[PDB]
Design a protein around this motif. Structure first.
Motif, PDB file in Angstrom:
ATOM      1  N   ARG A 129     -23.877 -17.208   9.819  1.00  0.00           N
ATOM      2  CA  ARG A 129     -25.323 -17.051   9.732  1.00  0.00           C
ATOM      3  C   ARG A 129     -25.986 -17.272  11.082  1.00  0.00           C
ATOM      4  NH1 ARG A 129     -26.709 -18.431   5.202  1.00  0.00           N
ATOM      5  NH2 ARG A 129     -25.523 -20.383   5.310  1.00  0.00           N
ATOM      6  N   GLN A 130     -25.493 -18.237  11.851  1.00  0.00           N
ATOM      7  CA  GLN A 130     -26.079 -18.529  13.152  1.00  0.00           C
ATOM      8  C   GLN A 130     -25.726 -17.503  14.218  1.00  0.00           C
ATOM      9  OE1 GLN A 130     -24.963 -22.895  13.711  1.00  0.00           O
ATOM     10  NE2 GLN A 130     -27.164 -22.947  13.301  1.00  0.00           N
ATOM     11  N   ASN A 131     -24.938 -16.489  13.890  1.00  0.00           N
ATOM     12  CA  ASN A 131     -24.549 -15.472  14.854  1.00  0.00           C
ATOM     13  C   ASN A 131     -25.453 -14.249  14.834  1.00  0.00           C
ATOM     14  OD1 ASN A 131     -22.758 -15.335  16.939  1.00  0.00           O
ATOM     15  ND2 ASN A 131     -21.125 -14.346  15.774  1.00  0.00           N
ATOM     16  N   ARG A 132     -26.513 -14.263  14.053  1.00  0.00           N
ATOM     17  CA  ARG A 132     -27.403 -13.119  14.000  1.00  0.00           C
ATOM     18  C   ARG A 132     -28.337 -13.110  15.208  1.00  0.00           C
ATOM     19  NH1 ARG A 132     -31.910 -11.792  10.981  1.00  0.00           N
ATOM     20  NH2 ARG A 132     -32.540 -11.278  13.120  1.00  0.00           N
ATOM     21  N   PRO A 133     -28.836 -11.944  15.600  1.00  0.00           N
ATOM     22  CA  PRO A 133     -29.715 -11.864  16.768  1.00  0.00           C
ATOM     23  C   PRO A 133     -31.136 -12.299  16.436  1.00  0.00           C
ATOM     24  CG  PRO A 133     -29.407  -9.701  15.859  1.00  0.00           C
ATOM     25  CD  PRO A 133     -28.524 -10.610  15.061  1.00  0.00           C
ATOM     26  N   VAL A 134     -31.924 -12.466  17.494  1.00  0.00           N
ATOM     27  CA  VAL A 134     -33.322 -12.879  17.335  1.00  0.00           C
ATOM     28  C   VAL A 134     -34.095 -11.773  16.635  1.00  0.00           C
ATOM     29  CG1 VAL A 134     -35.416 -13.510  18.556  1.00  0.00           C
ATOM     30  CG2 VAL A 134     -33.221 -14.357  19.344  1.00  0.00           C
ATOM     31  N   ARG A 146     -24.677 -17.378  21.173  1.00  0.00           N
ATOM     32  CA  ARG A 146     -24.056 -16.324  20.389  1.00  0.00           C
ATOM     33  C   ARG A 146     -22.573 -16.271  20.707  1.00  0.00           C
ATOM     34  NH1 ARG A 146     -26.261 -11.190  19.191  1.00  0.00           N
ATOM     35  NH2 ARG A 146     -25.286 -10.411  17.275  1.00  0.00           N
ATOM     36  N   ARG A 147     -21.759 -16.041  19.683  1.00  0.00           N
ATOM     37  CA  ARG A 147     -20.316 -16.094  19.836  1.00  0.00           C
ATOM     38  C   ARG A 147     -19.666 -14.889  19.176  1.00  0.00           C
ATOM     39  NH1 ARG A 147     -19.850 -17.021  14.706  1.00  0.00           N
ATOM     40  NH2 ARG A 147     -17.771 -17.327  13.818  1.00  0.00           N
ATOM     41  N   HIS A 148     -18.496 -14.527  19.686  1.00  0.00           N
ATOM     42  CA  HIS A 148     -17.662 -13.485  19.112  1.00  0.00           C
ATOM     43  C   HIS A 148     -16.391 -14.108  18.562  1.00  0.00           C
ATOM     44  CE1 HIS A 148     -14.825  -9.911  19.359  1.00  0.00           C
ATOM     45  NE2 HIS A 148     -15.766  -9.532  18.515  1.00  0.00           N
ATOM     46  N   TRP A 149     -15.944 -13.614  17.408  1.00  0.00           N
ATOM     47  CA  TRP A 149     -14.813 -14.227  16.725  1.00  0.00           C
ATOM     48  C   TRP A 149     -13.546 -14.223  17.559  1.00  0.00           C
ATOM     49  CZ3 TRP A 149     -10.508 -11.325  16.113  1.00  0.00           C
ATOM     50  CH2 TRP A 149     -10.649  -9.941  16.152  1.00  0.00           C
ATOM     51  N   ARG A 150     -13.435 -13.330  18.533  1.00  0.00           N
ATOM     52  CA  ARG A 150     -12.213 -13.222  19.311  1.00  0.00           C
ATOM     53  C   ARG A 150     -12.300 -13.904  20.664  1.00  0.00           C
ATOM     54  NH1 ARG A 150      -8.917  -7.568  18.918  1.00  0.00           N
ATOM     55  NH2 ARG A 150      -6.837  -8.417  19.341  1.00  0.00           N
ATOM     56  N   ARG A 151     -13.502 -14.088  21.203  1.00  0.00           N
ATOM     57  CA  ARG A 151     -13.634 -14.659  22.536  1.00  0.00           C
ATOM     58  C   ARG A 151     -13.622 -16.180  22.493  1.00  0.00           C
ATOM     59  NH1 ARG A 151     -17.207 -11.180  24.116  1.00  0.00           N
ATOM     60  NH2 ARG A 151     -18.839 -12.469  23.161  1.00  0.00           N
ATOM     61  N   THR A 152     -14.552 -16.772  21.755  1.00  0.00           N
ATOM     62  CA  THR A 152     -14.698 -18.218  21.691  1.00  0.00           C
ATOM     63  C   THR A 152     -14.438 -18.677  20.267  1.00  0.00           C
ATOM     64  OG1 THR A 152     -16.219 -18.433  23.554  1.00  0.00           O
ATOM     65  CG2 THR A 152     -16.310 -20.115  21.850  1.00  0.00           C
ATOM     66  N   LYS A 153     -13.379 -19.451  20.081  1.00  0.00           N
ATOM     67  CA  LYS A 153     -13.064 -19.986  18.769  1.00  0.00           C
ATOM     68  C   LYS A 153     -13.932 -21.197  18.487  1.00  0.00           C
ATOM     69  CE  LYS A 153     -10.724 -17.368  17.947  1.00  0.00           C
ATOM     70  NZ  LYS A 153      -9.999 -16.592  16.916  1.00  0.00           N
ATOM     71  N   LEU A 154     -14.444 -21.279  17.265  1.00  0.00           N
ATOM     72  CA  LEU A 154     -15.348 -22.371  16.950  1.00  0.00           C
ATOM     73  C   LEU A 154     -14.622 -23.690  16.748  1.00  0.00           C
ATOM     74  CD1 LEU A 154     -14.527 -22.074  13.888  1.00  0.00           C
ATOM     75  CD2 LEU A 154     -16.662 -20.852  13.569  1.00  0.00           C
TER      76      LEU A 154
END
Lengths: 72, 97, 85, 43, 60
Positions: free
Chosen positions: D17-22, D33-41
RNA sequence: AGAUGGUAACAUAUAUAUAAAUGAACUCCUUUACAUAGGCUUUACACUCGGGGUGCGUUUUCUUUGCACUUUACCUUUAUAACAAACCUUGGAAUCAAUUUACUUGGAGAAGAGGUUCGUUGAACUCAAUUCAAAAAUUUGUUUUGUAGCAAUAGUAAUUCGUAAUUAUCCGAAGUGGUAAGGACUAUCCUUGAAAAAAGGAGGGAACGGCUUUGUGCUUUGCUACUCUUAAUACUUGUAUGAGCGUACCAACAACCGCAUCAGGUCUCCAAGGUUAACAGCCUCUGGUUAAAUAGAAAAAAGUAGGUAAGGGAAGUCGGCAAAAUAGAUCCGUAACUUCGGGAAAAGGAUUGGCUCUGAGGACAUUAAUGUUAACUCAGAACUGAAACGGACAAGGGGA
RNA sequence: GAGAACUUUGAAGACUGAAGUGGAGAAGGGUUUCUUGUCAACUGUGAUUGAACAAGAGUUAGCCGCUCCUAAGGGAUAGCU
RNA sequence: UCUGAUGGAGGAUCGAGUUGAUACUGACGUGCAAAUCGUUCAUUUCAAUCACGUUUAGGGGCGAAAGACUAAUCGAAAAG
């Protein structure tokens, strides 16, 4: 599913309040043979009739307020 | 046992004869791996619209379809014709589509 | 025919380990795998089940005994002294 | 994995939910903002 | 463009993806199809077919 | 106040539904519950062969042809059938016998004969019902039906019809042994290969009808049609079924970890055909792919990964580094030494294709003799060819 | 399609060769899944593709699992330091 | 005593896989890779291999012993 062969047992099961539907299946063998299946809460009881006369007589004598379903 | 292959529709169109078909079945059915010993046990009769094969030995109905396909392939007809089973004992020539 | 001249059951060991070691282990494996008299049923059908337990295939009865034989001389001597009285 | 705990699943939903744009209408007046493949949570 | 239709046709006809054949012409209707129902309908009318399995004879 | 058969092993409640066969305290067991190796065997699945049907394909020529489909879940204590075992009755064994692939077993009771049970499986066996003949105040032989019910109504492959419907098929036999499980065994251990929840069996024998009544749970008088078990309904009980959580997708080839869309790493199951010892190698069917941080052209040096080389054959080099040399299988032959087990595939020879044949190795019935039928496995002989045949793949160099 | 060697379709030639870039799962990931758009950057060439970007949507259990039991073992109570 | 079968033992043999890593002192060495690739090689019934769970924590652990390993860090880890 349970198969029953005794005609008196078949009618006795049919007259019971639990029984709701009777399924009539007819199909050609080689003569048309039929299968009468009472649907009870517990099981589905089938009897196989090789002749047509007896099958028709049993179906007609069957208690009528329980619903009939013919598969073919 | 009698097998019947009809050709009413194709010969009514007059795209194919019956004499050639019947002759072909006469010299091509192989019994005992031999191509000209039909004699008493296997015979082929005549009809103006159909073809009848009477058999008295173990036989396969698929042989008739095989031979019919052979004939219509030799006569450049197989592109428009099909052999379809009519009943338990009969084939039939049918057009496409 | 006879398969080995003298190595006997130790043929399973091949050439490994010393000849003296193989002969010594043979001497006691011979009696470890032997059948003994079941004094309860009289049939020579008592075999070693584990290191000190011997079971009769017929009696189905088991008895504590030696490591490699049903009885040991030290135990039989003690039993003899006891039963003398 | 396919098998998850309830709290972990809710955390995953929150992170999605927190990955949506403004919102555009708000932009009339994001960087986390994060991408599932670049930065792991990692959580 | 027709990847969705290939997937759905393979699932519907119970065959591999590489065994389904679209009509090379008349692909506009195929692209219009986007459901199992429509793909069934236009397979029945003959725009997708199931290519025959490669022959592996045993005669030798 | 608690049922019954069988000599016995044990069995019996089939009501819609085998629900009820009294049982306390206190105990004693069983299941759960267990290693490895080896072969033997049974079943299911897999694969394959032949026949029937249906559709397709080849069709210059040949081809009774090549291919595809021809299916059947859980559940019904599934009923039965069959089989390895164990047990019971009878029987009473040396001229010992039964018996396994193997050894296993017997006067502590074998063989034979007749039974019981469990376990494997899950319609086998006329299994069930039905038709026809022979037993008596209910049995045995002969047909039909049904994929035993589930079940064909579903799937599958076809042929048609407005564009949703009709129709026909879904059955006659077998072989190989790949996988999995089970069984009965044998063997190994100075290694003996979890527990509990939960469930069951037993030993024991505490308590005892109903209606009414005297007296202080008990003695009592008068009468007998009553206690358990399953199901349904009604009312009362707080509202008198089935909680909560996970469930998409990747699992590496770009979804994970390696700073990345990294030739790396990362656990498990399913496992077709041909050749073959083989889940090897090589080729193929189902499924998948034709993509890889690029393409096109030219094609010299040099590099890198390979090939081949006359004559010589380690002269090269620190060093035979690297490469080459046969290498499968069958038959033959095999030294020193030795801890007698080995050494050993020692060393070292010969053969190997294709085709046409010959011989050997089994199972099933009839009145000592005649027919039906299967597996590939060995052995031998002709003929044949540019003397070649483990033709590719695969695959020891030996010795002092 | 403005634009096609690397998007899609058909044909062909081939590969993977049931020890498979085939099907199911675990750990790990966390929406990458699906549909519809879409190309600023990324997709080390192109790109109309995409695991990118955008908007929506998608995960249904008495019977599959967890939940229960106990194991190697962990924490804690009583004490005692 | 000798012969033929049967039988199926062994920290037995060859050998894929698995687990490793002998040699080319090959490639690469501004790598695909902070250890990879190719061929070759060792290993496959056991002192075997793997997974998950669990125990042992830093002058400590753990070690079929190399000063090995203890998260690319070890003759005393890493963080402050």
């Amino acid at each position: 599913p349970k198969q029953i062969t005794d005609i008196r047992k078949f009618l006795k099961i049919s007259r019971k309040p639990d029984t709701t539907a009777v399924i009539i299946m007819k199909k050609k063998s080689k003569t048309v043979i039929t299968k009468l299946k009472l649907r009870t809460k517990k099981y589905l009881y089938t009897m196989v009739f090789a002749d047509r006369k007896k099958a028709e007589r049993i179906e007609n004598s069957l208690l009528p307020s329980l619903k009939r379903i013919y598969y073919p | 046992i009698k097998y019947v292959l009809d050709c009413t529709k194709p010969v009514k169109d007059t795209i194919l004869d019956i004499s050639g078909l019947e002759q072909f079945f006469k010299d091509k059915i192989k019994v005992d791996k031999k191509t000209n010993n039909l004699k008493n046990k296997v015979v082929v009769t005549s009809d103006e619209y159909k073809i009848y094969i009477t058999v008295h030995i173990p036989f396969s109905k698929r042989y008739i379809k095989y031979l019919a396909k052979k004939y219509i392939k030799m006569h450049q007809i197989r592109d428009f014709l099909r052999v379809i089973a009519k009943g338990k004992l009969a084939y039939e020539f049918k057009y496409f589509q | 025919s006879r398969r080995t001249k003298k190595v006997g059951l130790t043929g399973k060991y091949g050439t490994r380990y010393g000849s003296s070691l193989r002969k010594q282990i043979k001497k006691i494996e011979l009696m470890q795998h032997a059948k003994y008299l079941c004094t309860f049923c009289g049939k020579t059908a008592t075999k070693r089940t584990c290191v000190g337990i011997w079971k009769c295939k017929k009696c189905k009865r088991k008895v504590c005994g030696g490591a490699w034989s049903l009885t040991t001389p030290a135990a039989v001597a003690a039993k003899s002294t006891i039963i003398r009285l | 994995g396919s098998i998850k705990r309830f709290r972990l699943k809710q955390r995953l939903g929150k992170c999605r939910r927190q990955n949506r744009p403004v919102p555009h209408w708000y932009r009339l007046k994001n960087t986390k903002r994060r991408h599932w493949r670049r930065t792991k949570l990692g959580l | 463009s027709l990847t969705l239709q290939k997937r759905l046709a393979a699932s519907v006809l119970k065959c591999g993806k590489n065994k389904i054949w679209m009509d090379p012409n008349e692909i506009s209707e195929i692209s219009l199809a986007n459901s199992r129902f429509s793909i069934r309908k236009l397979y029945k009318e003959g725009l997708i077919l199931k290519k025959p399995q490669k022959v592996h004879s045993r005669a030798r």
